[PDB]
Amino acid sequence: MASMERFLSVYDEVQAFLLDQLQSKYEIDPNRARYLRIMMDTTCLGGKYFRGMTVVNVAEGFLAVTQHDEATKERILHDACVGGWMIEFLQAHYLVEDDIMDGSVMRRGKPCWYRFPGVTTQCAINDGIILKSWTQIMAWHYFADRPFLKDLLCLFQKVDYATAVGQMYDVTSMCDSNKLDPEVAQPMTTDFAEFTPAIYKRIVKYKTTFYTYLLPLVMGLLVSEAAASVEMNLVERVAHLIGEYFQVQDDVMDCFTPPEQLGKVGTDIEDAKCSWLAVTFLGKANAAQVAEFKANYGEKDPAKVAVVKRLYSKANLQADFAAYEAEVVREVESLIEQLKVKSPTFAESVAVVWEKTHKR
């Protein structure tokens, strides 16, 4: 955790850079500077730093096998940290805005940012916008002269857009596609015909995998000037696979993990989310159980939510999860083997990403 230390120190630097700039070029006053400092901390700190630290880890692995001056080593580690915080702030953006979109109450055992008394939705929507603009201000400042600037900005931009499209797939996942119409209020599906594996996979791929796995791995390659070292179709396939697994864990926990341990009260049932539980349950239920699911899903009534949870328990979805978990393990190993050929170093970083995902 020398690595973590360096990561968290660069946070303080980037924060001081951003706030200093607000004063020198944006005419900000101290009280507004303090409000943003607080906003930044509250929204960007307190997680595990998985996405940002992956950039750092990928760069550290290349540093162990690549010849450089010390000053160059330090520059590469600094860039990996700044790149990691670009991802963290991008995540922060999306969590602030998603929490508002969904009317969420808590995140990480603390209230959602919009719910803070002196924030409100009015300021919070803009605060999220600020979060994401800070990523660009970081990039243009710290990476102005870097040969990877263009590639890094273009990647970032595509990942951002993927994530927004994924959010659209998510927010629309309980509607019937043939009924989407801005002019007409959308009913919740009655047939659940679109609660399929292929459809779930589409949501998760765009909404999470791009920003959580693809971006930190490819950013670590880009700040290392190492991208031609790997087969980018392979990196993409392994990110999309690990990414899917990660969300299937999150889906299971939303239902079954105690709220104090989850950091929030899960509401995927009431929200009629296209979860791995729902999709899996529908792939194996009999006619009477499908009917009972339809009568009870997507409803705030706790009585009906508890009917859903009992259908899940009875249907033995733990056996489906274990089968899934074993197959993802096969596939992740296969892809690591394919990466080992070209870059053993990069394959080991992917192995570590997978280990941290698989046993969290």
| 275: CB partners within 8 A, 6+ apart | 200, 251, 254, 255, 268
The region of 49-57, 70-78, 296-304, 342-350 touching ligand LWD under the rule CB under 6 A is: 70-78
Q: How far is the CB of 95 from its own copies (least distance, A)?
A: 13
* Tokens read off for 193: 């015909």
Torsion 137-151-45-122 (CA) sign: positive
Q: Does 138 bind ligand LWD (CB under 6 A)?
A: no
**Gaps (C–N > 2.5 Å) in the chain: which residues precede them?**
none
Cβ closer to ligand LWD: 78 or 342? 78
Which x/- pattern over 188-207 shows residues binding its own copies (rule: CB under 8 A)? --------------x--xx-
236 known member of a binding site: yes
Q: Which of 22, 45, 63, 285 binds its own copies (CB under 8 A)?
A: 22
Q: What is the DSSP string of 314-327?
A: HTTHHHHHHHHHHH
Cβ closer to its own copies: 118 or 258? 118
Q: How far is the CB of 85 from its own copies (least distance, A)?
A: 16
Spatial separation of the C-alpha atoms in residues 285 and 252, rounded to whole Å: 18
CB of 265 closer than 8 Å to CB of 106: yes
99 known member of a binding site: no
State the helix-helix crossing angle for 344-358 and 215-223, rounded to 10 degrees: 150
Spatial separation of the C-alpha atoms in residues 198 and 279, rounded to whole Å: 10
Compute the CA torsion angle 255, 261, 262, 267 (nearest 10 deg): 50
Q: Which of 9, 72, 140, 334 binds its own copies (CB under 8 A)?
A: 140
DSSP 3-state of 72:
helix
Q: Does 288 bind its own copies (CB under 8 A)?
A: no
Say how many Å lie between the first and final Cα of the chain, rounded.
18
Q: Which of 204, 248, 227 is nearest to 357 (CA)?
A: 248
Q: List the single partner that 46 binds among ligand LWD, Zn ion, its own copies, none, CB under 5 to 8 Å by kind.
A: none
How big is the chain, counted in residues?
360
Q: How far is the CB of 158 from its own copies (least distance, A)?
A: 8
Residues making up the annotated binding site for Mn(2+) are 98, 102, 170, 250, 254
- Residues binding its own copies (CB under 8 A): 22, 26-29, 31-32, 34-36, 38-39, 42, 97, 100-102, 116-119, 121-123, 125-127, 129-130, 133-134, 136-137, 140, 149-150, 153-154, 157, 160-162, 164-165, 167-169, 171-172, 177-186, 202, 205-206
- Residues binding ligand LWD (CB under 6 A): 1, 4-6, 8-13, 16, 45, 74, 77-78, 81, 197, 200-201, 276, 279-280, 323-324, 327
